[PDB]
RNA sequence: GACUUAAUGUCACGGUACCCAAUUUUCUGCCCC
């Protein structure tokens, strides 16, 4: 004899089951949950205390599913997810307090409460402490949370209890024989219940292998990295190989997609890469008579550093982004975002040529930088092609970061007058990285390439001053060319024309001599140029000069733009529209770098518009790091013979007497690799 | 050892928070966030009363920052003695860390101290820092401090009254608004203690070293802000009301009128605008005299007492608190009770969008960054102060949470499950003296948004960061300070209502009513902005010029919180910018305290009385010179100003204004109060306008119908065109609308006309007399239209498609698709054209056949043909019986879009009268001024607006309504039941012909076409203007040359048609066409000389042959519906309708000829209006004929239908062309009145005439009665 | 004096109660035992 309440609860449960189908799209799932939760709330409006227990269970389930359908907008857990979990916890608390007496209903209520609580602890430790969660999980397993062959949530409860140091010895066989148990869950059971390192390792190898085909937004990635963190905290020997295997899986997954070089942010990618780097470094610190294995380990370290340094950031920028525009560009973003969101929701719903690191021309030495937060100290990996050897050195970046922040704060107020802080920063770089001035680390007279890590991208590594009473400038001995990542390097096989192009949209009163009195004549130059003029370059020249102070987006690197006419050309529009710059030297003078990227906070995955020019095939970008008076970049452009040789004699080695002269000479760096 | 007593006074509402110690402070986020606020600690155990104070550590921190800035400005020396850089690092290993960590840039200089500061000798900066003293952090011990900042106590509470927290503080909520979407990401709560009363604090500062006296005193004079407010430091009943509201709500519940409690609370809170006389003198509306039940709201019996008398008793009981407070709290309590009992409409409550983020308490462990900032030597630091006035160009609104929810202390918490019943009534932020307030929070948020726009780049404000943001926007706001400003005006705010129209039925959604309180347009708030820096930025000057109003700027300070409906566009006025020379004139800055709290005097003084060291700023570049203004700010919002010519009455229908004003009338036009300067007060005459909400909703509906986006199931994550250019829950709108203010208003001498309608019973043919209602709209006429000059703003970024959509909406408005205001279906607020202003818009300016007649002829020559010799007598009205066959469509045609297969357009038709037409103007009872000589005589004039004759659209709409309903066998829409015969006419008729209640059971063809309750009709009629014909009917004689004294028009008795209880209702009553007006015209002298001179009516009539032209705008009609409508309008030759007064006397026989028809559609090429040829009209009429055949069971023959034949016999004119034909139609004489048989003396007798024959004779048209 | 601080380090002026809603649908100022 069903009633209106029972039939409405049945309809809500049917809607919840439909939204619990893994084949359901994330966009339709939200509407389905809204309908079911609206029905359930409507029933609760009339039965605040007389509501049946099962309706409360349905409400708690719907709130759990709401919480799992809310994605983190940025780098922090949204408060809406916490609020949804808290509301579900309160509803299930009212379910439990109203003792219906049914054993099955009590078991289901405790299962839902435990699932809500483990997720709430996962995203918020303070409000759902470990002790409270352990007590609740013990109560749930006392209530009958033992069937692992039908409910995956019960397996989750058992694994969470294993993580909390609670004896799950009795249920181990049932957990292992269960068909719904995950590979990672079985590995955790083996490591925690039986402490069988061999079985756990050989069975989690399967999980690491299977992670290749799952997007980084999936839950299994976060859980795997958390398991690695726990293993490292327990000083277990299994974490060293596990980190490397998961890193390899991440490389395989990342390389599959991302034609525009963007990745998904999940807040444990950096931790995973740091653990992989630390594991490979520790494996490289063993006593082996053969040096080939050590060289391979250091090359693996450089591979780890390089694989991290070629992708992008959080999702609110992905949602906002830009309209249709290019059909090829927007399709990739749509596919990537859709697959990532779908994988994220499915995790909880049941269920050109890339040059190798050793492909460096003779007489060139490259330096790879990596800073891992878990170790808290920096790494510098150098590769000398002539000696065909790899070695790495350590340094600390905390005081270096503080000095860089001091210089950045002073510059953003007293740009030209902050040269003393720039000299202090250069001296700090030289002091904290003495290996740059070591003959063994970097041979004298070698052309040095830098692949800086996050906030080292903002440091004038070419302008570092040796830690001596008469310390020599690093620029005086080596030719430095920078690069965001080694994967951005290409081969100069493009055909170079004979023309020079001098675009300009800078404010009137500057560069007047260059435009009217063209020193090199110019062919397709312009004054007050727009994005169309840049897009209309057909034959790739030996020199394209762009003179327009650009702008930055503090969140999306794709929206950093050069302020040309008709709205200016953005970072993404360069990739899609611009085609005629294959192998073209660029003296982009967009009023310093600092205009195009944001201001750093020891995280600088943001890439300037110069790397877009590198991607579209430019042979090199000679930009400016900090704002300088216009005649300096005008003289650089007028330097038409075909960089450190110019800076060496222009006054770049005069930090002792005239810091302002040092300020506006070191500001120029060459981005790109011949 | 000079013990300095320090007096601290505030000039803005400062913020205070509960103390919660230090160890317990970290537990609560609110106290951790408010560490820089004043501290409140309770005294009693009840948590109601306590003491407020400011910790000496916070004052010490402010003074230390002041010393830092003062030394930095003077290159690290004060009064000639050099000071070193001090120390701001605490090593973890050596000792404990300070309880507060800096996390901020530190001003530094080039040392210049002779020796390192030590215990024996320390610089004044080191002495003030208290470095080398005997006191540290590990223990307080005692006063070993070289300098000691004691705890600052609230000096205002100079009594033993034990002040409560409610008396001092008031809770407020502040957002963090997302720049890209315009929606708040989260919020936080704070307590604002009023500076007026509890705004002074006393404390002691004990300094032992005399070497730092001057520096300490100067820093005391230099610290400007503290606890969230500007300051200067000097060295020296509801419970009874709630119970009564509960009683009122319970009385309404037993009266089954709970839904009226919302409007009752709204009206009661509206009475605060009036005086006490609305209650003391009983000035509330008394309702209709013929209502026989009193007012529908103010006469509800509250436990045996009328609601007006109950309100009078409540006022007599609670006059102590005041009229404004009493009305406000009574309305608030009634609204809260109504919300508690009934709540939830849209179910936007799955997850509470409210977020209590508190910057995560700024919790960190491993940063401890010291960032020294060294300004270059020789740089010039100056402070620019900008003083002006914020004039509100539009009615503003600064939101605030409900007073019952704020309640500082025991504040309401949303931690309860089911966070629903979000308040539908919103209050405006006000000062403690009911003065309108612009908080520096909202002003600073608007300034930050505008600087972000001007720069072109900026960050979303991050909370709890360990490093200062160095974006260009954040750099400027760190050196920009403002002031909280209130107006000198304290009158209560107007309450503005909005509804949600259901797109399916174009009717108000149930429970969609919500209200806001808006300040009057024209208030001026003081404006203070200071900028301490080295150079006034171009972006700040650009923002000021954007805000400033000029001859051609209008001001663009979008403050407030309802910018989508154009609320809060302020304009800077009287801008005076002064500057301090902080490098050479800082002693003057300290002496004058930077003119903090005295900016009003600065604004109202000449340059000769300026304080020393303060000079006017003469380098404020103009708008044409700023680059950020021209490129970033100027094209951000582009206005589209235009005027609307409404050639019809306009009724925006203010609802509560009709419940409180003493006019005692149903509907009145909307008007708003406007503030005026120079004679500072509310302007005595309110300005009539169409709400910005109505304007915005009209354009939104037009765009949604054109694109088809309207009527979607939900827009929770929609990216459709309508959501893109009109906003949704997750995005602010890109278009902003303002009021359509009436400018052509003083050209009438009677702006508002009184038009009263009534509903006519279908059976008896007379008015119900209980459904009679009167509207009081603006008197708009075709020759003197109302001009509504409004505007809207368009954000930069629309593509071609979106701008085309906006232009298409404007074109639809010009074409008259969407009339403004209420009663648009009967010709109210019909737009007769539009005139886009040619100044601002450019793209918008660039982006803008034979006679028809029916040849059908209906003979109807049964009886009248044989009467050509000596004539017969026919009873004036007959009845039409169509049976019980009523076909109701459950799949009603909705209004979401223009369906492709459905016709939409406009019918232009001309009306010519065959008999004198009588359309009384019942606005006044003595229009002809004949009541002075004749007492109790009803004198009327022909209906006219602004002195030009026209037929009301309601008349034509009702006449076509009854004709169509009789033609299509629709139900009796306006049947009047509950009348006894002497069943009660309820069971007398079949259930099929009863009026349709809802949309579930279906709608009749008439109810589906012209619409019923909660379903807007698809056919709209307009007023019939006068074109040609003789001006009036002369009737030379004892008349004023254009009027006739009609005979008595007795009430239609529903007993002749139903003589016995067994007899059923005949049907719809129709009136024959005849020339019976001749006898009335010739018997003028013998009709007013008889008895009963009060029941006769004298009114203006006009001769036959007058041409009236009106429009019938149809929309989304089926193929056959348009044909049926055309047949109703022009049913062919020798067939005409009856319209106006005196139908039984033969007056008002009107023939309608369809002059033309037009039809528009939607095409990819943007096809305009096109007129159909005769063939299409014939096809529509034929298909309507086949539809009628289908319902029943080349040239159409309508007389084949049994009931259409009777209808056309009823509406057949015999004198159209037959000169010989002239039937005589008269009402039979009761007894000995005018016998020049045919008498009621023997007509009901069974022997004379049986009932069954007389009922049949009444149902057969043109049946002779002899 | 406690209530009520800690001191060589308080950007909380470090955050816009902000975002979406046509007071409107329906009604001839009509008329005889
Ligand atoms: Zn000192
Ligand atoms: Zn910022
Ligand atoms: Zn939409
Ligand atoms: Zn009906």
UniProtKB/TrEMBL annotation, chain A:
Residues 511-638 form the CHAT domain. It comes from the Bacteria. Pfam families: CHAT. This is CHAT domain protein.
């Amino acid at each position: 004899e069903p009633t209106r309440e029972d039939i409405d609860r049945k309809e809500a449960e049917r809607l919840l089951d439909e939204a619990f189908n893994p084949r359901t799209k994330p966009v339709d799932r939200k509407k389905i949950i809204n309908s079911a939760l609206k029905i359930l709330i409507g029933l609760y409006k009339e039965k605040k205390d007389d509501l049946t227990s099962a309706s409360f269970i349905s409400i708690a389930r719907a709130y759990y599913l709401v919480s799992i359908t809310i994605l983190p907008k940025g780098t922090t857990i949204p408060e809406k997810k916490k609020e949804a979990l808290r509301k579900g916890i309160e509803f299930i608390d009212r379910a439990i307090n109203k003792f219906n007496g049914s054993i099955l209903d009590s078991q289901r209520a405790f299962r839902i409460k435990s699932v809500l609580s483990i997720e709430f602890n996962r995203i918020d430790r303070e409000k759902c402490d470990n002790i409270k969660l352990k007590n609740l999980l013990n109560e749930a397993v006392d209530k009958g949370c033992t069937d692992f062959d039908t409910y995956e949530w019960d397996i989750q409860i058992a694994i969470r209890l294993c993580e909390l140091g609670v004896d799950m010895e009795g249920h181990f066989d049932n957990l292992i024989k269960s068909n719904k148990a995950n590979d990672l869950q079985k590995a955790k059971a083996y490591y925690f219940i039986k402490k069988d390192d061999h079985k756990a390792k050989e069975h989690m190898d399967k999980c690491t292998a299977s992670l290749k085909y799952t997007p980084c937004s999936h839950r299994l990635w976060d859980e795997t990295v958390g398991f690695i963190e726990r293993l490292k905290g327990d000083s277990s020997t299994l974490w060293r190989d596990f980190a490397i295997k998961t890193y390899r899986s991440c490389r395989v997954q990342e390389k599959e997609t991302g034609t525009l070089r963007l990745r998904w942010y999940w807040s444990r990618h950096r931790v995973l890469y740091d653990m992989a780097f630390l594991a490979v470094k520790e494996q490289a610190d063993d006593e082996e008579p053969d040096v080939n294995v050590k060289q391979a380990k250091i090359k693996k370290l450089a591979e780890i550093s390089d694989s991290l340094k070629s992708r992008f950031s959080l999702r609110l920028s992905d949602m906002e982004k830009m309209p249709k525009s290019d059909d090829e560009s927007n399709h990739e973003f749509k596919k990537f975002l859709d697959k990532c969101v779908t994988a994220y929701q499915d995790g909880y719903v049941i269920n050109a040529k890339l040059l190798e690191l050793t492909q460096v021309p003779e007489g060139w030495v490259v330096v790879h930088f990596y800073l891992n937060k878990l170790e808290g100290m920096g790494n510098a990996i150098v590769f000398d092609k002539c000696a065909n050897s790899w070695q790495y050195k350590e340094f600390q970046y905390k005081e270096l970061f503080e000095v860089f922040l001091t210089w950045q704060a002073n510059y953003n107020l007293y740009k030209e007058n902050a040269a003393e802080h720039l000299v202090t920063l250069c001296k700090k770089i030289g002091e904290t990285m003495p290996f740059l001035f070591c003959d063994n680390f970097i041979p004298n007279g070698k052309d040095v390439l830098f692949v800086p890590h996050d906030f080292l991208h903002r440091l004038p590594l070419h302008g570092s001053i040796e830690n001596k009473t008469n310390g020599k400038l690093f620029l005086e001995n080596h030719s430095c060319c920078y690069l965001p990542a080694w994967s951005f390097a290409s081969e100069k096989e493009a055909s170079t024309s004979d023309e020079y192009v001098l675009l300009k949209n800078f404010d009137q009163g500057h560069f007047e001599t260059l435009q009217n009195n063209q020193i090199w004549g110019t062919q397709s130059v312009k004054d007050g140029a727009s994005s169309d003029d840049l897009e209309n370059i057909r034959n790739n020249p030996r020199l394209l000069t762009i003179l327009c102070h650009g702008e930055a987006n503090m969140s999306n690197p794709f929206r950093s733009m050069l302020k040309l006419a008709n709205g200016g050309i953005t970072y993404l529009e360069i990739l899609n529209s611009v085609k005629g710059l294959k192998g073209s030297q660029v003296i982009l003078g967009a009023c310093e770098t600092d205009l195009v990227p944001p201001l750093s906070d020891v995280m600088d995955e943001h890439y300037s518009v110069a790397t877009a020019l590198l991607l579209i095939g430019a042979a090199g970008v000679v930009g400016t790091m900090w704002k300088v008076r216009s005649n300096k970049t005008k003289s650089l452009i007028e330097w038409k013979l075909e960089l450190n040789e110019w800076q060496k004699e222009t006054g770049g080695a005069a930090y002792k007497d005239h810091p302002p002269t040092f300020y506006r000479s070191i500001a120029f760096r060459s981005i790109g690799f011949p | 050892d000079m013990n300095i007593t320090v007096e601290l006074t505030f000039f803005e509402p400062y913020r205070l928070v509960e103390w919660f110690d230090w160890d317990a402070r970290k537990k609560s986020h609110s106290a951790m966030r408010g560490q820089a606020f004043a501290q409140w600690t309770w005294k009693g155990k009840g948590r109601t009363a306590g003491k407020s104070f400011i910790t000496g550590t916070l004052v010490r921190s402010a003074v230390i920052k002041a010393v830092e800035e003062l030394l930095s400005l003077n290159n690290g020396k004060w009064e000639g003695v050099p000071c070193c850089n001090g120390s701001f690092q605490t090593d973890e290993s050596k000792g404990k860390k300070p309880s507060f960590l800096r996390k901020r840039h530190t001003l530094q200089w080039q040392a210049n101290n002779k020796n390192i500061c030590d215990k024996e000798e320390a610089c004044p900066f080191c002495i003030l820092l208290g470095r080398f003293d005997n006191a540290g952090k590990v223990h307080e011990r005692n006063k070993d401090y070289d300098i000691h900042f004691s705890n600052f106590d609230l000096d205002h509470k100079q009594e033993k009254n034990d002040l409560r927290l409610v008396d001092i503080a008031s809770g407020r909520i502040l957002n963090r608004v997302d720049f890209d979407t315009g929606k708040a990401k989260d919020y936080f709560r704070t307590w604002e203690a009023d500076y007026e009363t509890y705004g002074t604090y006393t404390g002691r500062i004990t300094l032992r070293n005399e070497h730092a006296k001057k520096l300490l005193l100067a820093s005391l004079g230099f610290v400007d802000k503290l606890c969230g407010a500007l300051c200067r430091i000097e060295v020296i009943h509801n419970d009874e009301l709630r119970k009564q509201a509960e009683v009122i709500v319970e009385a309404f519940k037993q009266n089954d009128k709970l839904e009226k409690i919302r409007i009752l609370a709204d009206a009661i809170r509206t009475l605060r605008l009036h005086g006490e006389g609305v209650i003391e003198k009983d000035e509330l509306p008394d309702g209709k005299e013929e209502r026989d039940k009193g007012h529908h709201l103010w006469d509800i019996k509250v436990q045996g007492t009328a609601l007006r008398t109950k309100l009078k008793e409540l006022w007599q009981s609670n006059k102590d608190i005041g009229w404004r407070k009493f009305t406000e709290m009574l309305g608030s309590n009634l609204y809260l009770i109504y919300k508690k009992e009934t709540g939830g409409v849209s179910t936007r409550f799955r997850i509470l969008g409210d977020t209590e983020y508190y910057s995560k308490a700024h919790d960190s462990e491993g940063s401890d960054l010291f960032i020294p900032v060294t300004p270059p030597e020789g740089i010039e630091t100056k402070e620019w102060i900008i003083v002006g006035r914020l004039k509100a160009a539009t009615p503003f609104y600064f939101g605030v949470q409900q007073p019952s929810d704020s309640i500082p202390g025991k504040e309401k918490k949303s931690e309860d499950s089911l966070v629903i019943n979000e308040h539908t009534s919103f209050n405006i932020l006000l000062d403690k003296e009911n003065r309108y307030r612009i908080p520096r929070s909202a002003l600073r948020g608007a300034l930050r948004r505008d600087l972000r726009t001007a720069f072109g780049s900026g960050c979303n404000v991050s909370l709890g960061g360990q490093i200062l943001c160095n974006c260009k926007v954040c750099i400027e706001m760190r050196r920009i300070t403002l002031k909280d400003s209130v107006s000198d005006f304290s009158e209560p705010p107007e309450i503005r209502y909005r509804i949600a129209k259901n797109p399916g039925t174009a009717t108000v959604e149930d429970g969609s009513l919500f209200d806001i309180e808006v300040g009057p347009e024209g208030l001026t708030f003081p404006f203070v902005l200071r900028y301490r820096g080295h150079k006034f930025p171009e972006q700040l000057s650009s923002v000021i010029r954007y805000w400033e109003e000029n001859d051609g700027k209008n001001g663009m300070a979008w403050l407030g919180g309802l910018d989508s409906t154009g609320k809060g566009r302020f304009a800077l006025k009287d801008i005076k910018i002064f500057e301090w020379d902080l490098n050479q004139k800082i002693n003057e800055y300290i002496k004058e305290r930077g003119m903090r709290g005295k900016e009003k005097e600065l604004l109202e003084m000449g340059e000769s009385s300026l304080p020393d060291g303060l000079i006017p700023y003469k380098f404020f570049e103009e708008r044409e010179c700023l680059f950020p203004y021209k490129e970033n700010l100027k094209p951000q919002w582009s206005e589209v100003q235009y005027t609307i010519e409404v050639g019809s009455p306009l009724l925006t229908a203010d609802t509560i204004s009709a419940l409180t004003e003493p006019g005692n009338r149903d509907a009145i036009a909307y008007k708003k109060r406007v503030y005026n300067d120079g004679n500072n007060a509310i302007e005595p005459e309110p300005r009539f306008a169409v709400k910005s909400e109505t304007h915005r909703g009209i354009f939104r509906t037009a765009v949604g119908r054109r694109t088809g986006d309207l009527g979607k199931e939900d827009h929770e994550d929609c990216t459709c065109d309508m959501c893109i250019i009109f906003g949704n829950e997750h995005e602010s709108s890109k278009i902003r609308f303002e009021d359509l203010e009436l400018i052509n208003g003083n050209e009438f001498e009677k702006l508002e006309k009184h038009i009263d309608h009534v509903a006519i019973d279908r059976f008896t043919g007379g008015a119900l007399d209980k459904a009679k209602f009167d509207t009081y709209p603006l008197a708009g006429s075709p020759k003197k239209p109302l001009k509504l000059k409004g505007r809207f703003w368009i954000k930069k970024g629309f593509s071609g498609d979106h701008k085309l959509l906006i232009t298409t909406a404007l074109s639809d408005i010009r074409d008259g698709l969407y009339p403004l205001g209420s009663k648009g279906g009967v010709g109210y607020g019909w737009v007769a054209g539009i005139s886009i202003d040619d100044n601002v818009p450019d793209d918008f300016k660039e982006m803008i056949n034979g006679p028809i007649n029916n040849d059908y002829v209906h003979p109807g020559h049964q009886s009248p043909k044989q009467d050509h010799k000596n004539k017969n007598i026919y009873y004036p009205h007959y009845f039409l019986d169509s049976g019980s066959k009523v076909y109701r469509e459950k799949d009603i045609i909705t209004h979401e879009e223009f369906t492709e297969e459905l016709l939409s357009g406009k019918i232009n038709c001309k009306l010519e009268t065959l008999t004198p037409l009588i359309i009384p103007d019942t606005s006044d009872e003595n229009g002809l001024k004949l009541q002075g000589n004749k007492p109790g005589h009803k004198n009327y004039k022909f209906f006219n607006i602004n002195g030009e004759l026209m037929i009301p659209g309601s008349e034509l709409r009702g006449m076509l309504r009854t004709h169509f309903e009789a033609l299509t066998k629709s139900c009796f829409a306006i049947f009047g039941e509950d009348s006894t015969l002497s069943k009660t006419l309820g069971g007398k008729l079949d259930k099929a012909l009863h009026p349709c209640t809802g949309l579930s059971d279906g709608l009749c063809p008439g109810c589906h076409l012209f619409g019923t309750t909660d379903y807007k009709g698809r056919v709209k009629f307009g007023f019939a203007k006068y074109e040609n014909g003789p001006e009036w009917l002369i009737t030379r004689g004892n008349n004023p040359e254009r009027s006739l004294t009609l005979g008595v028009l007795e009430s239609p008795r529903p007993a002749f048609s139903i003589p016995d209880d067994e007899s059923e209702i005949p049907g719809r009553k129709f009136y024959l066409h005849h020339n019976g007006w001749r006898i009335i015209r010739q018997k003028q002298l013998e009709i007013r000389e008889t008895v009963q001179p009060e029941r006769n009516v004298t009114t203006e009539v006009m001769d036959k042959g007058n041409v009236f032209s009106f429009d019938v705008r149809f929309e989304n009609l089926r193929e056959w519906e348009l044909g049926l409508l055309l047949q109703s309008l022009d049913p062919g030759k020798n067939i005409a309708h009856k319209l106006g007064k005196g139908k039984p006397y033969g007056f008002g026989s009107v023939k309608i000829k369809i002059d033309s028809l037009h039809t528009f559609k939607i095409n990819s090429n943007n096809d305009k209006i096109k007129r159909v040829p005769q063939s299409d009209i014939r096809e529509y009429i034929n298909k309507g004929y086949q539809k009628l055949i289908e319902w029943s069971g080349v040239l159409p023959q309508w007389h084949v239908i049994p009931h259409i034949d009777k209808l056309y016999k009823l509406l057949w004119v015999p004198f159209l062309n037959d000169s010989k034909l002239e039937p005589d139609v008269r009402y039979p004489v009761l007894n000995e009145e005018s016998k020049g048989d045919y008498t009621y003396k023997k007509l009901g007798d069974k022997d004379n005439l049986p009932y069954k024959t007389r009922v049949k004779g009444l149902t057969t048209p043109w049946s002779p009665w002899n």
